[PDB]
Amino acid sequence: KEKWGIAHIYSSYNNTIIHITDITGAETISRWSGGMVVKADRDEPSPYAAMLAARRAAEEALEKGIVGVHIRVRAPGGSKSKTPGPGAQAAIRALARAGLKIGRVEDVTPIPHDGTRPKGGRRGRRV
RNA sequence: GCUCGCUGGGGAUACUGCGGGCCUUGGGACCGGGAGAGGCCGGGGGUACCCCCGGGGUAGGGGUGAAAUCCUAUAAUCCCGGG
Ligand SMILES: [Mg+2]
Ligand SMILES: [Mg+2]
Ligand SMILES: [Mg+2]
Numbered sequence A: 001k002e003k004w005g006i007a008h009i010y011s012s013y014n015n016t017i018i019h020i021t022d023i024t025g026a027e028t029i030s031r032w033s034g035g036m037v038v039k040a041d042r043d044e045p046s047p048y049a050a051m052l053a054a055r056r057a058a059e060e061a062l063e064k065g066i067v068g069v070h071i072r073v074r075a076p077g078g079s080k081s082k083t084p085g086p087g088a089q090a091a092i093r094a095l096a097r098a099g100l101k102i103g104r105v106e107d108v109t110p111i112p113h114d115g116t117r118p119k120g121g122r123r124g125r126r127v
Numbered sequence B: 001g002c003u004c005g006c007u008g009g010g011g012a013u014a015c016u017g018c019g020g021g022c023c024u025u026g027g028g029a030c031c032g033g034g035a036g037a038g039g040c041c042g043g044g045g046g047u048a049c050c051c052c053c054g055g056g057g058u059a060g061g062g063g064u065g066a067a068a069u070c071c072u073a074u075a076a077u078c079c080c081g082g083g
């Protein structure tokens, strides 16, 4: 038939993580981050690092029989920033280029209905 | 003229004071259909977050203007099932 999986993309201002699981999520097919493809901390969240990691993960997934994925992309969320970093969309485009079919795309950033207090004080970072 | 102050009497009744009568306009009481994150007490929920147990997977995660302390093979970051 068609073996379909899920691509979980975690994108912040400091790094990017691309993690492919099966359709239920309980089994890990492949997992690559920005620090595994570059040597400098400054380049970890760049679009090019996201492309490289997505390509490695997609190749490992294709060798094992995955044909397509559905995509779940998230920023850190909670009491941290709600906006994804610059690597998410580059990672999305690279998966399709490497040979995977793409299903539905959704954002799953966790959002509180008035949760906890964030760091920094009532004055924030002072730079 | 000044010591603008005191005292014996006579007259007036507009205003203020005091006594009696009569009002409803200010204020208060009550009745009707509605408005509101006003207050107190009891019950039922919402996501988010932290810790613990079990499954997967394996070398990094976190963080800055740039780094380091810190966390991680006693298996982290990430994903799934529960408390
Ligand atoms: Mg790193
Ligand atoms: Mg501090
Ligand atoms: Mg300064």
Ligand SMILES: [Mg+2]
Binding pocket: none
């Ligand atoms: Mg485990």
